[PDB]
Amino acid sequence: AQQRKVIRCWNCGKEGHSARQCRAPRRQGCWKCGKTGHVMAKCPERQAG
Ligand SMILES: [Zn+2]
Ligand SMILES: [Zn+2]
Numbered sequence: 001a002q003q004r005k006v007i008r009c010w011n012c013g014k015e016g017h018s019a020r021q022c023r024a025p026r027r028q029g030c031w032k033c034g035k036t037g038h039v040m041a042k043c044p045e046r047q048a049g
Contacts, residue, residue, distance in 0.1 A: 010019035011027045029037040033045055 006015035007018060008015050009017045009022040010031065011022040012024040014022065028034040030039045030043040032040050033043055035043065038044070
């Protein structure tokens with residue numbers, strides 16, 4: 001049904017801008033999984049937590 005989306009703001013995920021202007025608090029360091037300061041460079045990707 002509603003199949004349409006505008007530029008999704010990376011970092012927070014909001015159709016309206018990108019990651020250069022978005023820095024909300026809810027932000028998530030990594031993005032392939034979404035967690036916090038941690039990033040793909042050091043993302044555990046599902047661990048013992
Ligand atoms: Zn945003
Ligand atoms: Zn991550």
